[PDB]
Design an enzyme around this catalytic site. Structure first.
Site, PDB file in Angstrom:
ATOM      1  N   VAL A 116      44.781  37.734  41.038  1.00  0.00           N
ATOM      2  CA  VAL A 116      45.308  36.391  40.904  1.00  0.00           C
ATOM      3  C   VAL A 116      45.398  35.994  39.444  1.00  0.00           C
ATOM      4  CG1 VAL A 116      44.541  35.588  43.137  1.00  0.00           C
ATOM      5  CG2 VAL A 116      42.996  35.450  41.181  1.00  0.00           C
ATOM      6  N   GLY A 117      45.833  36.938  38.609  1.00  0.00           N
ATOM      7  CA  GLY A 117      45.967  36.641  37.194  1.00  0.00           C
ATOM      8  C   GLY A 117      45.425  37.663  36.211  1.00  0.00           C
ATOM      9  N   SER A 118      45.994  37.647  35.008  1.00  0.00           N
ATOM     10  CA  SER A 118      45.574  38.557  33.950  1.00  0.00           C
ATOM     11  C   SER A 118      45.671  37.918  32.564  1.00  0.00           C
ATOM     12  CB  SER A 118      46.409  39.845  33.980  1.00  0.00           C
ATOM     13  OG  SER A 118      45.998  40.689  35.046  1.00  0.00           O
ATOM     14  N   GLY A 119      45.377  38.734  31.550  1.00  0.00           N
ATOM     15  CA  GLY A 119      45.411  38.283  30.170  1.00  0.00           C
ATOM     16  C   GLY A 119      44.601  39.224  29.283  1.00  0.00           C
ATOM     17  N   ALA A 120      44.382  38.806  28.030  1.00  0.00           N
ATOM     18  CA  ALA A 120      43.610  39.601  27.066  1.00  0.00           C
ATOM     19  C   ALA A 120      42.094  39.409  27.289  1.00  0.00           C
ATOM     20  CB  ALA A 120      44.004  39.205  25.628  1.00  0.00           C
ATOM     21  N   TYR A 121      41.748  38.387  28.082  1.00  0.00           N
ATOM     22  CA  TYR A 121      40.360  38.060  28.427  1.00  0.00           C
ATOM     23  C   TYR A 121      39.801  39.120  29.385  1.00  0.00           C
ATOM     24  CZ  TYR A 121      42.249  36.422  32.997  1.00  0.00           C
ATOM     25  OH  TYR A 121      42.870  36.350  34.227  1.00  0.00           O
ATOM     26  N   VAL A 172      41.314  39.014  36.581  1.00  0.00           N
ATOM     27  CA  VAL A 172      40.606  38.315  37.633  1.00  0.00           C
ATOM     28  C   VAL A 172      41.186  38.569  39.019  1.00  0.00           C
ATOM     29  CG1 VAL A 172      40.044  36.029  38.580  1.00  0.00           C
ATOM     30  CG2 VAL A 172      39.608  36.558  36.163  1.00  0.00           C
ATOM     31  N   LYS A 186      35.870  38.592  37.921  1.00  0.00           N
ATOM     32  CA  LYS A 186      36.464  38.915  36.617  1.00  0.00           C
ATOM     33  C   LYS A 186      35.931  40.205  35.988  1.00  0.00           C
ATOM     34  CE  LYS A 186      36.672  36.714  32.026  1.00  0.00           C
ATOM     35  NZ  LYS A 186      36.438  35.369  31.432  1.00  0.00           N
ATOM     36  N   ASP A 205      35.221  28.319  31.122  1.00  0.00           N
ATOM     37  CA  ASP A 205      35.503  28.895  29.828  1.00  0.00           C
ATOM     38  C   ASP A 205      34.450  28.642  28.783  1.00  0.00           C
ATOM     39  OD1 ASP A 205      39.190  29.209  29.595  1.00  0.00           O
ATOM     40  OD2 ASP A 205      37.727  29.926  31.077  1.00  0.00           O
TER      41      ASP A 205
HETATM   42  O1  LIG Z   1      38.619  29.182  40.867  1.00  0.00           O
HETATM   43  C1  LIG Z   1      38.395  29.798  39.833  1.00  0.00           C
HETATM   44  N1  LIG Z   1      37.209  30.399  39.717  1.00  0.00           N
HETATM   45  C2  LIG Z   1      36.746  31.182  38.584  1.00  0.00           C
HETATM   46  C3  LIG Z   1      37.705  31.311  37.410  1.00  0.00           C
HETATM   47  C4  LIG Z   1      37.354  32.064  36.219  1.00  0.00           C
HETATM   48  C5  LIG Z   1      36.039  32.775  36.050  1.00  0.00           C
HETATM   49  C6  LIG Z   1      35.025  32.237  35.206  1.00  0.00           C
HETATM   50  C7  LIG Z   1      33.771  32.905  35.056  1.00  0.00           C
HETATM   51  C8  LIG Z   1      33.541  34.124  35.768  1.00  0.00           C
HETATM   52  F1  LIG Z   1      32.365  34.745  35.641  1.00  0.00           F
HETATM   53  C9  LIG Z   1      34.533  34.688  36.611  1.00  0.00           C
HETATM   54  C10 LIG Z   1      35.769  34.018  36.748  1.00  0.00           C
HETATM   55  F2  LIG Z   1      36.651  34.635  37.576  1.00  0.00           F
HETATM   56  C11 LIG Z   1      38.297  32.131  35.142  1.00  0.00           C
HETATM   57  C12 LIG Z   1      39.560  31.484  35.227  1.00  0.00           C
HETATM   58  N2  LIG Z   1      40.479  31.435  34.371  1.00  0.00           N
HETATM   59  C13 LIG Z   1      41.462  32.548  34.150  1.00  0.00           C
HETATM   60  C14 LIG Z   1      41.533  32.832  32.617  1.00  0.00           C
HETATM   61  N3  LIG Z   1      41.695  31.577  31.792  1.00  0.00           N
HETATM   62  C15 LIG Z   1      40.646  30.547  32.032  1.00  0.00           C
HETATM   63  C16 LIG Z   1      40.550  30.169  33.532  1.00  0.00           C
HETATM   64  C17 LIG Z   1      39.904  30.771  36.392  1.00  0.00           C
HETATM   65  C18 LIG Z   1      38.992  30.659  37.523  1.00  0.00           C
HETATM   66  N4  LIG Z   1      39.310  29.909  38.758  1.00  0.00           N
HETATM   67  C19 LIG Z   1      40.386  29.394  38.839  1.00  0.00           C
HETATM   68  C20 LIG Z   1      41.443  30.213  39.550  1.00  0.00           C
HETATM   69 CL1  LIG Z   1      41.135  31.836  40.215  1.00  0.00          CL
HETATM   70  C21 LIG Z   1      42.767  29.713  39.716  1.00  0.00           C
HETATM   71  C22 LIG Z   1      43.110  28.424  39.204  1.00  0.00           C
HETATM   72  C23 LIG Z   1      42.141  27.618  38.514  1.00  0.00           C
HETATM   73  C24 LIG Z   1      40.812  28.082  38.327  1.00  0.00           C
HETATM   74 CL2  LIG Z   1      39.733  27.033  37.460  1.00  0.00          CL
END
Ligand SMILES: O=C1NCc2c(-c3ccc(F)cc3F)cc(N3CCNCC3)cc2N1c1c(Cl)cccc1Cl
EC number: 2.7.11.24
Length: 348
Positions: free
Chosen positions: A27-32, A35, A50, A165
């Site tokens: 459900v998403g990617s990036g340089a971080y 996830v 993540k 974050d």
């Molecule tokens: O619902 C969550 N849960 C965790 C979560 C983490 C995360 C943080 C710490 C960790 F240990 C593991 C993680 F997975 C990181 C991000 N970003 C992705 C990268 N940029 C910052 C937010 C987004 C989420 N969202 C999220 C999602 Cl899945 C979709 C939409 C909105 C939110 Cl808040």
């Protein structure tokens, strides 16, 4: 007696996780990193997993990863992103090279919610309350978020808020250039490096957020650092003598004195129709001089939050030792310290 792991290719990378985690859906990617959403058969929870990419590629990175894990392990608060599980498929420190962090699945951030929904003064009341409640907890442990924005704030079906974050890699100069939301919520002292910023940089961000939820418009959508400073001074007035002395950057201090002085504007005429109590709180939050800015604890006791405020349900944190921040170590040492943290993790 460590769980048995199963591998699978996801997000171009091979994910190895314990069997309890099923139905991994990217459900998403990036340089971080990368996830994934997944079902945790042990707790029945819907979780977000993540995987960090090359967590130990450089000393800077090895330290970053250690920092993120320390922060995430310390956070035990309702309005702050907690850590449900952390693991590596490695059986020894030599094999160690992959780190996975598991947390709650929230589903969306503050930008989403606001979009398809109309926030009432009670909505705004409740959302900001939670941010403040989590910041009181963060700050009491001498932790500064440094980058609060609506996208770092997760909200769920029940409007329950969690701050995200932490220990994430600082933004590059190219990331905070121009007409970008990555700089609109920053405090001026840290946008232009006037002085050594403190935890009230976060309070400034909160005000920018609260005003946006109230008006539905970016409070300071500057087209660049300068234009944004101008929009800021237009609202809160040019700096006074006291603040000027506090600006170390003499080139900065020299630039401010070049701008025509301007008086603070009347917030009741800027925020038309808004609950006069919200306006008052915004004025105590959006103060140029960070020394005179309201603290999160003090804000929670502000009349605007009477409907939610409860001094016995606004917990502080345990001490958070971050002496490691000034510690100089090699990649392997940061990594070894990260490993200990992973294996000493205790599920909540
Ligand atoms: O619902 C969550 N849960 C965790 C979560 C983490 C995360 C943080 C710490 C960790 F240990 C593991 C993680 F997975 C990181 C991000 N970003 C992705 C990268 N940029 C910052 C937010 C987004 C989420 N969202 C999220 C999602 Cl899945 C979709 C939409 C909105 C939110 Cl808040």
């Amino acid at each position: 007696e460590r769980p048995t792991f199963y591998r699978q290719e996801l997000n171009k990378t091979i994910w190895e996780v314990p069997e309890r985690y099923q139905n991994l859906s990217p459900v998403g990617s990036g340089a971080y990193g990368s996830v994934c959403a997944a079902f945790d058969t042990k707790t029945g929870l819907r979780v977000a997993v993540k995987k960090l990419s090359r967590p130990f590629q450089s000393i800077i990175h090895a330290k970053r990863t250690y920092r993120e894990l320390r922060l995430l392990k310390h956070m035990k608060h309702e309005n702050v992103i907690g850590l449900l599980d952390v693991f590596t498929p490695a059986r020894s420190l030599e094999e160690f090279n992959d780190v996975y962090l598991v947390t709650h699945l929230m589903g969306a951030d503050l930008n989403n919610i606001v979009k398809c929904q109309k926030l009432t003064d009670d909505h705004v009341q409740f959302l900001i309350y939670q941010i403040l409640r989590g910041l009181k907890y963060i700050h009491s442990a001498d932790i500064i978020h440094r980058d609060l924005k609506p996208s770092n704030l997760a909200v769920n079906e029940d409007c329950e808020l969690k701050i995200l974050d932490f220990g994430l890699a600082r933004h590059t100069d190219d990331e905070m250039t121009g007409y970008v939301a990555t700089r609109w919520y920053r405090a001026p002292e840290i946008m232009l490096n006037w002085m050594h910023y403190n935890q009230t940089v976060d309070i400034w961000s909160v005000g920018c957020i609260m005003a946006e939820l109230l008006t539905g418009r970016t409070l300071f959508p500057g087209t660049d650092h300068i234009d944004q400073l101008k929009l800021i001074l237009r609202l809160v007035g040019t700096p006074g003598a006291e603040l000027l002395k506090k600006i170390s950057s003499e080139s900065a201090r020299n630039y401010i004195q070049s701008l025509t002085q301007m008086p603070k504007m009347n917030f009741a005429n800027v925020f038309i129709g808004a609950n006069p109590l919200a306006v008052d709180l915004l004025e105590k939050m959006l103060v140029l001089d960070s020394d005179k800015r309201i603290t999160a604890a003090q804000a929670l006791a502000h009349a605007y939050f009477a409907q939610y405020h409860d001094p016995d349900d606004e917990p502080v944190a345990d001490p958070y030792d971050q002496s490691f921040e000034s510690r100089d170590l090699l990649i392997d040492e940061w990594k070894s310290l990260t490993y200990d943290e992973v294996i000493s993790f205790v599920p909540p």
